[PDB]
Amino acid sequence: VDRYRVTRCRHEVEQGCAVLRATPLADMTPQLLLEVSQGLSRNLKFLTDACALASDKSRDRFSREQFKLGVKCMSTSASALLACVREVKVAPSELARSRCALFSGPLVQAVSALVGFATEPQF
Amino acid sequence: VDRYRVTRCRHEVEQGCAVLRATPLADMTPQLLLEVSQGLSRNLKFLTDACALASDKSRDRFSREQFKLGVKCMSTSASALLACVREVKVAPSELARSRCALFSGPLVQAVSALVGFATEPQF
């Protein structure tokens, strides 16, 4: 895989999660919330695409399965977060905004675990 | 839900993940690795059971979906970790042991997000 660009993905997911923690409820407009979701989905797509290719090289059967489980953990984390984001759009509250921070950790960690695996010194 | 016992679950998952980081490769026997997996699966079952019940109370449709997405994030994190654990059993190496620490974060965070949601001041 390409060390530089999987790292840039991970940086962009952390950046987008940071937007959801940094931005007060008053400034969480439909448009700000949409740019963040689109930036997250963009970076998840690339990372899933970057990992499919790496699965294709490795002869090892554990690796191929770990990419599959790593990507699925990433995609289920993403869905839990994107539902909180949608929800703070249609039902603004300090609590729904807190909920976004709460469901960021799982996504940031799922991405960090996938990218750390992908840059083991044999890809 | 029962604040005391969902918190004890979260503590036990953190404890079991800590065993995989604390224990040198030499001491990671089949039996130690098995007790940790069984303790994790025990605590995930309880937490999934504790959350099904909470889903059953809430009239809110977002909550019901968030429990579903929260549990699924937890169960996909668990699978990614348990494959690394199995793998350090059948292919002991410092790298496979590191991989266990790498795939703990997603599980600890998925559990922390689910338990934090479950103890929002309305359950």
Curated annotation (Swiss-Prot), chains A, B:
Origin superkingdom: Eukaryota
Recorded name of the encoding gene: TLNRD1
Described purpose of this protein according to its UniProt entry: Actin-binding protein which may have an oncogenic function and regulates cell proliferation, migration and invasion in cancer cells.
Organism: Homo sapiens
Protein name per UniProt: Talin rod domain-containing protein 1
Transmembrane domains' residue ranges: none
Up-regulation conditions: Down-regulated by microRNA MIR574-3p.
Subunit structure: May homodimerize. Interacts with F-actin.
